[PDB]
């Protein structure tokens, strides 16, 4: 069904499709094989539908969490990179594309949460979560606030909760243990206790959400906020003298934000696997290809070191990379729908006061 002799790549509309087109033009100049770059609407649902029928693009770009389900459905072909190319990428990035003990896709870009602070209102951001109450009181003495972020999202509340050993699913030897869940362990209990203490001590509002936090930060009413690279354009438009650093530690342990890795998968029914692998290894995942794609649309942290130390000159990119390295890699199995539901319910119950921290975490675990 997929035509041989050419490469078809599907990418999301918010990524660097023009840069991908330029890389494909370089590939066709080098080898004589044309490359087609498209950004179909509703890609997340369109790709599995066409892949289940033996059709679709030769190469697919999406976050690694759905690639596990795609490989479970058999829609992704196994890649065979040599040790020379494997050493060019980070070990945790390689871990991001491992399912059933076999590599299924090529990491491209790494995204994770980071601490965003106002330089004018706070030249030195705190390195620990315990300093936040004192800093917030000091700023309230000047009629301001220190830090407020999205408390309605488990993705945002996880870094504080899972700082001291909390984890979603146990990961050992390239396999995730579903029956082993650390939602209600000592570290997560301590993190959620600290969060609810911050809420109760009027340091943060339990009803604060993404819109309120973003507006408060871009209006200069806050000193710190927690957000990903996607808001950097918004703060740049708001012209706030902002800085990005590592997330504060809890009890001496670094925060563990969820890590999302953009990766390059190969269709199982695609008959152009050899040329797709060659293109990915020698033309796309190179300094020139990454810089072209970043020039089109920024990617933040990248899997390649040859471009990662190049992008490290940006403090925001360096902070995002170190936060991703220190954080928890997002697994790729379907039961995190239930995981998100349970953690969200536990967080809402703990913040709203209907249930205690221990009861909420026990309910989330069960």
């Amino acid at each position, epitope marked *: 069904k997929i035509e041989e002799g050419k490469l078809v790549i599907w990418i999301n*509309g918010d990524k660097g499709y023009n840069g991908l087109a330029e890389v494909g033009k370089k590939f066709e100049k080098d080898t004589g094989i044309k490359v087609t770059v498209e950004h179909p609407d509703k890609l*997340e649902e369109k790709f*599995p539908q066409v892949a289940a029928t033996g059709d679709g693009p030769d190469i697919i770009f999406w976050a690694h969490d759905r690639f596990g389900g795609y490989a479970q459905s058999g829609l992704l072909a196994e890649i065979t990179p040599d040790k020379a190319f494997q050493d060019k990428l980070y070990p945790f990035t390689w871990d991001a594309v491992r399912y059933n003990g076999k590599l299924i896709a090529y990491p491209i870009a790494v995204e994770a949460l980071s601490l965003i602070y106002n330089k004018d209102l706070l030249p030195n951001p705190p390195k620990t979560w315990e300093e936040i109450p004192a800093l917030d009181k000091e700023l309230k003495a000047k009629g301001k606030s220190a830090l407020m972020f999205n408390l*309605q*999202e488990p993705y945002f509340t996880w870094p504080l909760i899972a700082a001291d050993g909390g984890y979603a699913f146990k990961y050992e030897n390239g396999k995730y243990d579903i029956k082993d869940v650390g939602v209600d362990n000592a570290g997560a209990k301590a993190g959620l206790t600290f969060l609810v203490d911050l809420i109760k001590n009027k340091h943060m509002n339990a009803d604060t959400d993404y819109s309120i936090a973003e507006a408060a930060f871009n209006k200069g009413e806050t000193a710190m906020t927690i957000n*990903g690279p996607w808001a950097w354009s918004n703060i740049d438009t708001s012209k706030v003298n902002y800085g990005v650093t590592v997330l504060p530690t809890f009890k001496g342990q670094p925060s563990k934000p969820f890590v999302g890795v953009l990766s390059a998968g190969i269709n199982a029914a695609s008959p152009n696997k050899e040329l797709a692998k060659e293109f990915l290894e020698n033309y796309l995942l190179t300094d020139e290809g990454l810089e072209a794609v970043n020039k089109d649309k920024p990617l933040g942290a990248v899997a390649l070191k040859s471009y990662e130390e190049e992008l490290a000159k940006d403090p925001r990119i360096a902070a995002t990379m170190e936060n991703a390295q220190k954080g928890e890699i997002m697994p790729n199995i379907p039961q995190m729908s239930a995981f*998100w*539901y349970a953690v*969200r*319910t536990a967080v809402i119950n703990a913040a709203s006061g209907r249930q205690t921290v221990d009861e909420a975490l026990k309910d989330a675990q069960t």
Partner: nanobody
Amino acid sequence: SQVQLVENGGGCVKAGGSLRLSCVASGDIKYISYLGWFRQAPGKEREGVAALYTSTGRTYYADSVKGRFTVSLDNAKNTVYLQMNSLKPEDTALYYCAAAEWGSQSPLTQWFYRYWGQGTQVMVS
């Protein structure tokens, strides 16, 4: 695709009129926590018009439609509605229905949601 969204209720309405839209979600939709509505004029970027948080009932509205649109979800019918009151000619576009289990960005972004519907067309003269 176990989650499907179907839109209807779009009609030809004069300026200042009132219209209502419906979006029915079918399948395994127990894990969906965000319901959002998007409109896309022909040849224009898809813009967020409303968003709903199922867990707590929190609603989100854009600046251009704040105080004019009302979005609500019926749990007993698994259908989300949006009330289009005080219409203006600028409101004509192809209205889409979106749903997502979770997200890391603002709920008014098209990339926030994973499930998308076919869309309905509303014209205001």
